[PDB]
Design a protein around this ligand. Structure first.
Ligand SMILES: COc1nc2ccc([C@](O)(c3ccc(C(F)(F)F)nc3)c3cncn3C)cc2c(Cl)c1-c1ccc(S(C)(=O)=O)cc1
Length: 225
């Protein structure tokens, strides 16, 4: 577990992420000027819940595909048994997607980028999931308030996926080794960038599971009526 090896792993994970980040940050930031008009918003609000459901499910599906690309590029992930590979992804894919979403959230006006423009939470009114969506904005907002960086997201989400405590793992010790290495990389880098203070400010991991389990419950309902 050399120092050079540790720095190599950091750069690897950050490369893997930059290659699967789906939307470039500079594009997202540039678009913050572009906001949905009152009419446009009303457009989304008139759609049935099932319309918005199909739209968001496709958005979610395409996102999770990028998280799969990312995981497959994490050192040592592909060398796992196919069982553990599926366990980890089914258990952490949604969570990763949710963390990535803070890149699309603008904390200055509480708006999220969605299909070409930024819009508030009223945008997703049709779903009737105001409770949950408000929770998604709050999570993004707190991460956005920390000025979460691309590399930080890459290393955090790598740790979300590679969880040796996931029920159903067969080669558990094999993942434990992966988890340790990544955690060493994540903390070494926070220090190199003088950002280790965010660790106390980070939302608890349980809340990441609590917000996704609430979220994953709705998906089971919306399919298929
Ligand atoms: C807050 O609500 C949401 N906001 C979203 C914001 C963006 C996107 C996004 O897909 C996107 C953008 C950037 C990134 C990046 F950060 F990775 F780059 N990933 C993904 C997108 C938008 N326009 C183009 N794209 C690609 C999807 C969102 C979704 Cl799906 C929800 C949502 C989730 C669950 C429920 S529900 C059924 O559970 O109630 C309802 C709604």
């Amino acid at each position: 577990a050399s120092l050079t090896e540790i720095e190599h792993l950091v750069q690897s994970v950050c490369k893997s992420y930059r290659e699967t980040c789906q939307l470039r940050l500079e594009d997202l930031l540039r678009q913050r000027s572009n906001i949905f008009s009152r009419e446009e918003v009303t457009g989304y609000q008139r759609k049935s819940m099932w319309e918005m459901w199909e739209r968001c499910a496709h958005h979610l599906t395409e996102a999770i595909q990028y998280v799969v690309e990312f995981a497959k590029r994490l050192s040592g992930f592909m060398e796992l048994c196919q069982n553990d590979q599926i366990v980890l992804l089914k258990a952490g894919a949604m969570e990763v997607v949710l963390v990535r979403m803070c890149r699309a959230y603008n904390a200055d006006n509480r708006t999220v980028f969605f299909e070409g423009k930024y819009g508030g939470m009223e945008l997703f009114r049709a779903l009737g999931c105001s409770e949950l969506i408000s929770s998604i904005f709050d999570f993004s907002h707190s991460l956005s308030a920390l000025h979460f960086s691309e590399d930080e997201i890459a290393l955090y989400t790598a740790l979300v996926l590679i969880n040796a405590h996931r029920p159903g793992l067969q080669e558990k010790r094999k993942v434990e080794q992966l988890q340790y290495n990544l955690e060493l990389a994540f903390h070494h880098h926070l220090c190199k960038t003088h950002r280790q203070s965010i660790l106390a400010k980070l939302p608890p991991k349980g809340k990441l599971r609590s917000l996704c389990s609430q979220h994953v419950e709705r998906l089971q309902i919306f399919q298929h009526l």
